[PDB]
Write a protein that binds this DNA or RNA. Sequence first.
RNA 1: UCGGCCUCCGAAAUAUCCUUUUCUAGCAUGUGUCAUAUCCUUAACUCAUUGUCCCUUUUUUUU
Length: 140
Amino acid sequence: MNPLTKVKLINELNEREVQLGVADKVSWHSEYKDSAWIFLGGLPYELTEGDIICVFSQYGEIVNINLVRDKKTGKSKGFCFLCYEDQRSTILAVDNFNGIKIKGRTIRVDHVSNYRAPKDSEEIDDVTRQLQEKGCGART
RNA sequence: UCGGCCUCCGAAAUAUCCUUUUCUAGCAUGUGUCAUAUCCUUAACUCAUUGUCCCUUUUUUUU
Ligand SMILES: [Mg+2]
Ligand SMILES: [Mg+2]
């Protein structure tokens, strides 16, 4: 099953909801209300984390970022997890940003449930340790 | 300084007429063809549907 059909399946999830007239208290997103983590998939490999944060900031303030990278070479696998400060920004981003094109590639944005953080057992990098323990965020 | 109108009945809508009984009312008497419309007709002719199209981008939900 091609990834584009996954992008289309989330969009049809939304259109179908509109046709049936479902209320927001029982929307599909309400199953993911507890979490503030969203999966982004299909990204171009040229994008770095400043790019991801630069664009997905339209809907709120990003708390943490996990663009998963190859262990040996360090290059990007293409998918990362973002945590928003508001949980409602996840609704806005899954609706609005699913299936948009960046450098000619469509991306899928979906809610992630019970996201489990990476263990700091590895001492491979330092900046990743800073990102895990502290993470990106405005400083007064 | 005063200032106080009206009130309802029927008809024009469910006909009319004929026949036999029933009820009652009222009386009166007695030394062939090309190329175009149209008309008619035929077939117990039908009155929408939801039945993986998932196929596609170097793209792949993280110890
Ligand atoms: Mg008349
Ligand atoms: Mg008259």
